[PDB]
C-alpha cells in the first residue's frame, strides 16, 4: 500500500510541476513593460462640486441611479436618504428599525431601494410620488440570513437581488415572493463584497471574503469556476473591469491588485511606500483607464491602470472613506465617509 | 463784580437729580433681596454676603453729593472717608468671594466645606476693614493739627485770568491711596486667572470677574486725569468727571451682580495605603527607563 501511496504522491507532484511549468511558459511579458508604449497622462484638476449633508452619524454605503442624477445613501443610525445630487435636495427618507445599515442598492427602473444591516434581513421599499409618504407600510422583507447583511445588489432585472452576509453564504432571492432560487457556498469566513458581471449576457459574479480570497461563481448551478488568493489580509471591495475579462480588488494590506480571468493570474499591483492604511472601495473609469481607491487614511488615490503610477491624491475628508462609486455616464464619482458627509467630485 | 467763575443751574441740577434716582434704586433693591430671600441664585451667595455690596455701593454715590453741596472742611474730609470705606466693602468682598469658589471645589474631593458664608468670607472682611479704618483715623487726626497753622485744606485755582474758583486740595496721601486700590485689585485679577476652569452653575464666578477687570482699567484713568489736569480744571467740569466715573464703574457693578440672579436661569486603611504605592511602583518601572529612548 505504501508503494501505491508513493506512486500517487509522485503523480500529484508531476501534475503540480506541470501546472507551474505551464504557467511559467505562458508568463513572458509584464503589463507595465508592454504598456510603456502608451503615452503618459497629463495633470488632473478634479475638485469637489457638491457636498451633501443631513446624516446624523457615519455614512456606510451608497449607490448611483440610472438617470445619472439621483443618489441613495445609508447611515449608521438607520436612516436612508434618497437625494437629488445635481441640485442638492432631499427627496425621500425612512428610519429603519435597526442600526448599522451596511448595504443599499438602487433598482434599475428607479422604483425601489434595498437596505439591510444587523437585523440579518434585506428589505425592499417601493418608491412613489405621494405626499407625506410612509414607505414603512410598503416595506417588504425578502432575504433572511443568520448573520449581518454585508452587501446586496439588484440583478439586471427588478425581481432578483443578490445577498452576502457573515455566515459565508451568498444567496439569490425573488423580491416578490421571498422564495430562494440558488445558494452559494465556499467561503470559510465572512463575505464582505460582491459585484455583478458587466456583461448582461454573462451570468456570473465575483465575491471577496475575509479569508483573503476572491471567488468567481456561476449563477446557473452555484459552484465556483475560479479562485484567487494573493492578498495578505481581508479583501474589502471588488469590481469588474468594463471589458468583463478582469476584476480589481482592494484589500486591507493597503494594496489594490488587478487580476485576470483568461491568464488566471494577477497582472499588476498598485501600492506605494507612503501608503500604509488599507483600502476600502475601488471603482473604474468609463474606459477603464483609471482605478479610483478610497483609503482609510482619509484620502482618495487615483492610479493609472495600464502603467501603475499614481496620478493624483485628493484630500478633503475628515474621517475614513466608506464607499466610492462612479456615475453611469462616467463624468463624476461620489464618496461617502464617517464624517457624516458625501462629496461629489468631478 | 464778575471776578468769579460762572456756574450753571440746569446742567448742575440734572446731576444731583439723576443720582438721587440711582441712590433710591439702590435702596429699593435692598428690600427685594430680603423679601425674596429664597431662590436658586440668591441662596448660593448668601444675603449676609450679597447685601453688604448693595450697602457698600450706597457709600460710593456720596463723593458726588458732597461735591455739589459746598466745599469746606468736614466736606473735604468726608470725601475721603466715603471712598476708602466704600471700596474695601464692595471690591473687598467680591475678592474674598472669588477666593471661595476655588477652595470649595478642591474640598469636594473630600467632605469638609470649610468656607461658611458669614464665617470665613465675612470674618476675613473685618481684617480688611481694620487696616482701612486704622489709616483713616490717623489721617484725619494729622490734618487737624496742620489746619491750625497755615493750611486750610481748601485752596483756589485760576483759569482764563480773571476767573477764580474754590477747590479741594490734593495732598500727597492721595497719590498713595490710588496705588493701594490698584495693587489690591491685582489680587482680584490673579484670583480670576485660577477660576476660569472651575464648573459653576450660574456663571457668577464669571460676572464678578469682569467687574474687577473693569476697575483696574477704567479707574486708573480717572485718577491720572484728576491728578494732572487738576490745578486748572473747573468747578462744573470736576462734577462731571466724578459723575462720569461713579456711574460707569460702580453702577455697572451692582448691575453685573444683581440682575443676572433674577433673569438668566484603623489598620485596614493602612495596608491599602502601602499596596497602592506598590502598584505605582511596578507600573512606574515599565515606563521609567525600559526602552523609553527619552530618559537615556
Amino acid at each position: 500500500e505504501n508503494e501505491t501511496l508513493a506512486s500517487l504522491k509522485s503523480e500529484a507532484e508531476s501534475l503540480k510541476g506541470k501546472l507551474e511549468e505551464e504557467r511559467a511558459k505562458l508568463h513572458d511579458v509584464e503589463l507595465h513593460q508592454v504598456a510603456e508604449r502608451v503615452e503618459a497622462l497629463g495633470q488632473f484638476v478634479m475638485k469637489t462640486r457638491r457636498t451633501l449633508k443631513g446624516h446624523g452619524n457615519k455614512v456606510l454605503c451608497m449607490d448611483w441611479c440610472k438617470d445619472k442624477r439621483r443618489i441613495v445613501s445609508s447611515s449608521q443610525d438607520g436612516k436612508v436618504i434618497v437625494w437629488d445630487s445635481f441640485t442638492t435636495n432631499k427627496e425621500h427618507a425612512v428610519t429603519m428599525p435597526c442600526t448599522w445599515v451596511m448595504a443599499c442598492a438602487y433598482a434599475p427602473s428607479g422604483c425601489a431601494i434595498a437596505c439591510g444591516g444587523l437585523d440579518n434581513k434585506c428589505s425592499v421599499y417601493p418608491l412613489t410620488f405621494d405626499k407625506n409618504e410612509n414607505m414603512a407600510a410598503k416595506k417588504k422583507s425578502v432575504a433572511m440570513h443568520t448573520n449581518y447583511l454585508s452587501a446586496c445588489s439588484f440583478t439586471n432585472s427588478d425581481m432578483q437581488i443578490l445577498t452576502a452576509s457573515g455566515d459565508g453564504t451568498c444567496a439569490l432571492w425573488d423580491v416578490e415572493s421571498g422564495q430562494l432560487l440558488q445558494s452559494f457556498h465556499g467561503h470559510g469566513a465572512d463575505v464582505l463584497c460582491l459585484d455583478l458581471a458587466p456583461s448582461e449576457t454573462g451570468n456570473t459574479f465575483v465575491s471577496g471574503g475575509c479569508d483573503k480570497k476572491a471567488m468567481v461563481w456561476d449563477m446557473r448551478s452555484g459552484q465556483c469556476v475560479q479562485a484567487f488568493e494573493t492578498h495578505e489580509s481581508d479583501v474589502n471591495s471588488v469590481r469588474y473591469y468594463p471589458s468583463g475579462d478582469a476584476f480589481a480588488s482592494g484589500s486591507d494590506d493597503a494594496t489594490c491588485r488587478l487580476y485576470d480571468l483568461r491568464a488566471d493570474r494577477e497582472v499588476a499591483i498598485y501600492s506605494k511606500e507612503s501608503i500604509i492604511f488599507g483600502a476600502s472601495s475601488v471603482d473604474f473609469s468609463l474606459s477603464g483607464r483609471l482605478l479610483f481607491a478610497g483609503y482609510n487614511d482619509y484620502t482618495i488615490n487615483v492610479w493609472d491602470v495600464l502603467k501603475g503610477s499614481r496620478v493624483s491624491i485628493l484630500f478633503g475628508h475628515e474621517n475614513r472613506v466608506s464607499t466610492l462609486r462612479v456615475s453611469p455616464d462616467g463624468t463624476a464619482f461620489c464618496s461617502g465617509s464617517w464624517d457624516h458627509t458625501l462629496r461629489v467630485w468631478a | 463784580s464778575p471776578c468769579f467763575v460762572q456756574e450753571d443751574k440746569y446742567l448742575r441740577l440734572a446731576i444731583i437729580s439723576f443720582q438721587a434716582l440711582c441712590m433710591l434704586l439702590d435702596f429699593v433693591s435692598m428690600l427685594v433681596v430680603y423679601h425674596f430671600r429664597k431662590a436658586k441664585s440668591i441662596r448660593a451667595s448668601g444675603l449676609i454676603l450679597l447685601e453688604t455690596i448693595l450697602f457698600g455701593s450706597l457709600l460710593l454715590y456720596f463723593p458726588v453729593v458732597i461735591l455739589y453741596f459746598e466745599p469746606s472742611t468736614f466736606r473735604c474730609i468726608l470725601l475721603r472717608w466715603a471712598r476708602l470705606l466704600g471700596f474695601a466693602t464692595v471690591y473687598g468682598t467680591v475678592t474674598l468671594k472669588l477666593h471661595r469658589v476655588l477652595k470649595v471645589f478642591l474640598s469636594r474631593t473630600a467632605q469638609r466645606i470649610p468656607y461658611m458664608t458669614g464665617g470665613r468670607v465675612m470674618r476675613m472682611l473685618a481684617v480688611i476693614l481694620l487696616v482701612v479704618f486704622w489709616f483713616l483715623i490717623g489721617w484725619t487726626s494729622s490734618v487737624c493739627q496742620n489746619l491750625e497753622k497755615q493750611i486750610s485744606l481748601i485752596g483756589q485755582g485760576k483759569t482764563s485770568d480773571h476767573l477764580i474758583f474754590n477747590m479741594c486740595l490734593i495732598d500727597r496721601w492721595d497719590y498713595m491711596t490710588a496705588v493701594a486700590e490698584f495693587l489690591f485689585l491685582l489680587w482680584g485679577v490673579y484670583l480670576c486667572y485660577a477660576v476660569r476652569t472651575v464648573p459653576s452653575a450660574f456663571h457668577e464666578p464669571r460676572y464678578m470677574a469682569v467687574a474687577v477687570h473693569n476697575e483696574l482699567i477704567i479707574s486708573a484713568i480717572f485718577h491720572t486725569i484728576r491728578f494732572v489736569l487738576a490745578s486748572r480744571l473747573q468747578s462744573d467740569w470736576m462734577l462731571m468727571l466724578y459723575f462720569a466715573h461713579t456711574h460707569l464703574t460702580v453702577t455697572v457693578t451692582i448691575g453685573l451682580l444683581l440682575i443676572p440672579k433674577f433673569s438668566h436661569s484603623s489598620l485596614d486603611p493602612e495596608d491599602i495605603r502601602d499596596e497602592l504605592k506598590k502598584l505605582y511602583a511596578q507600573l512606574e518601572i515599565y515606563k521609567r527607563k525600559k526602552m523609553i529612548t527619552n530618559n537615556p
Binding site: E1, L5, L8, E11, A12, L15, K18, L19, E22, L26, D28, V29, V38, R49, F86, Y148, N156, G166, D174, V175, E176, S177, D190, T201, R220, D234, S243, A246, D260, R262, A263, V267, E273, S274, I276, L286, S287, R289, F315, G330, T331, W338, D339, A346 | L102, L106, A110, Y193, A194, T197, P199, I272, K277, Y280, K287, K290, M291, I292, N294, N295
Partner: protein
C-alpha cells in the same frame, strides 16, 4: 487584531526615526526663560519624512505625519489636540509601554485616579482643561460610595511621584497626558480607537484522489499568453479614450463642470449623434446595449424578412426579467411560437441544443433555453451583425 497591520507599520517608521546615524536628533533647548530638555521641533519631522519616504507633495507628508501623531506616537508638548504643524513647536515621542498596539482599554475607575492627581498638584491654581473639569464633576456623581478609595489611591501616587528626579519627573509626566488624550479625546476630535462593527467579532489515500481531480481542473482550463492578454486590455482601453469624460471633455460641456444640463438631454434624445453612431459599430454587444440600437437592428431584419431569430433572442431575457410566478406559462408560450414543430416562427437548432431543452421544458425555469441563447448569439455575431454594418442605412446615419 483589527488595526494591528497598520500599527506594525507606524512602529517600523518610529524605529527609523529613532536611529542615531540617520535619524532625528534630540536636543535640549533654552530660550532666555527656562530649560526645555530632550525635544525636537515640529519642522524637524516634516523635513525628515519628505526625504526618507520620498513624499514629493508637502501636504501629503504633513497629512501622513498628523495621522501618526493622532494615533499616539508623538505628541505636542503643550497642547491637547494631537497634530503635526510645520513650525517651531516642540514634540516628543511616546514610551513603548503606552503604545496603542499593546491592547489598551482603560476603565472609568482609572481615569478618575489620574484626574484627581492633577488637582493635588499645584493646589493654588487648579490647572486643568475646560472639558476635564466637567468630567471630574460627572465621575464623582457616579462613583459616590467608592469615591474614598479613588481619592485614597490618588494620594499614594502623588507622594510616590514626589520622590523622583526633576528632568525625569517632567518627561514621564507628559507621557501620561498623551495617553489619556488619545484615549479620552478633547470634544471635536475623531476617536481613533473606534473600530468597525464588522471586524469586532482516516485513510490518507482519499486525500490524494481529491488532489488529483483538483490538479486536472487547472490543466483543463485554457489560458492565453501575456502578450495576447496585454493586447486585449490596451486595445480595449485605447478604443474608448475619446469616450472617457475624465480624459477628453464632452460636447458641449461637462454638466458637473459648467452646469450645462444639455449633455444628458442630447444623449437621452431619440436622434443619435455622430459620436453615438460610431460606437454602434465597435461590436454587436455595444449596439444591443443601446435601446435605439435594438430598434434599428430589428427594423433592418424585418425588412430583410429574417427577424424571426431576433424575436427569439429578445424573448429569453424577458422571461428572465419576469418574476418566477409566471415562468411555467411563459416557457410554454416561447416553446410553441418559436422552436416547436410547425411554429409560425420556426427556427433551427443543433441536435445537442434541442435535446437539452426538450428534456428541460418539463421543468420550467429562468435558465431553460440558455444553450439556445448561446447558439443564436454566436451566429448573429458572425453573419447577421456584420451585414448590418455593410447595409447602406448604417453609413447614411454615420455621416450627417
Amino acid at each position: 487584531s483589527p488595526n494591528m497591520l497598520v500599527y506594525r507599520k507606524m512602529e517600523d517608521v518610529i524605529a527609523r526615526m529613532q536611529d542615531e546615524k540617520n535619524g532625528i536628533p534630540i536636543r535640549t533647548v533654552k530660550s532666555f526663560l527656562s530649560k526645555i530638555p530632550s525635544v525636537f521641533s515640529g519642522s524637524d519631522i516634516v523635513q525628515w519624512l519628505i526625504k526618507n519616504l520620498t513624499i514629493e507633495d508637502p501636504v501629503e507628508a504633513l497629512h501622513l505625519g498628523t495621522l501618526m501623531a493622532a494615533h499616539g506616537y508623538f505628541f505636542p508638548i503643550s497642547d491637547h489636540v494631537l497634530t503635526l504643524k510645520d513650525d517651531g513647536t516642540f514634540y516628543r515621542f511616546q514610551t513603548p509601554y503606552f503604545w496603542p498596539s499593546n491592547c489598551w482599554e482603560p476603565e472609568n475607575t482609572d481615569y478618575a485616579v489620574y484626574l484627581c492627581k492633577r488637582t493635588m498638584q499645584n493646589k493654588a491654581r487648579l490647572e486643568l482643561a475646560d472639558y476635564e473639569a466637567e468630567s471630574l464633576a460627572r465621575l464623582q456623581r457616579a462613583f459616590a460610595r467608592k469615591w474614598e478609595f479613588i481619592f485614597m489611591q490618588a494620594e499614594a501616587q502623588a507622594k510616590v511621584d514626589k520622590k523622583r528626579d526633576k528632568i525625569e519627573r517632567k518627561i514621564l509626566d507628559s507621557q501620561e497626558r498623551a495617553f489619556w488624550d488619545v484615549h479620552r479625546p478633547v470634544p471635536g476630535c475623531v476617536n481613533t480607537t473606534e473600530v468597525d462593527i464588522k471586524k469586532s467579532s482516516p485513510p490518507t489515500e482519499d486525500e490524494l484522489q481529491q488532489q488529483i481531480k483538483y490538479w486536472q481542473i487547472q490543466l483543463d482550463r485554457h489560458r492565453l499568453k501575456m502578450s495576447k492578454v496585454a493586447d486585449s486590455l490596451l486595445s480595449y482601453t485605447e478604443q474608448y479614450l475619446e469616450y472617457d469624460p475624465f480624459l477628453l471633455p464632452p460636447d458641449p460641456s461637462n454638466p458637473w463642470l459648467s452646469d450645462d444640463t444639455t449633455f444628458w438631454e442630447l444623449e437621452a434624445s431619440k436622434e443619435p449623434s455622430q459620436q453615438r453612431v460610431k460606437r454602434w459599430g465597435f461590436g454587436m454587444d455595444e449596439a444591443l446595449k443601446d435601446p435605439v440600437g435594438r430598434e434599428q437592428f430589428l427594423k433592418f431584419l424585418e425588412s430583410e424578412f429574417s427577424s424571426e431569430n431576433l424575436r427569439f433572442w429578445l424573448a429569453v431575457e424577458d422571461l428572465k426579467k419576469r418574476p418566477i410566478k409566471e415562468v411555467p406559462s411563459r416557457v410554454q408560450e416561447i416553446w410553441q411560437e418559436f422552436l416547436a414543430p410547425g411554429a409560425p416562427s420556426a427556427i433551427n437548432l443543433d441536435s445537442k441544443s434541442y435535446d437539452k431543452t426538450t428534456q428541460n421544458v418539463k421543468e420550467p425555469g429562468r435558465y431553460t433555453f440558455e444553450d439556445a441563447q448561446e447558439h443564436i448569439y454566436k451566429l448573429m455575431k458572425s453573419d447577421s451583425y456584420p451585414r448590418f454594418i455593410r447595409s447602406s442605412a448604417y453609413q447614411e446615419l454615420l455621416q450627417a
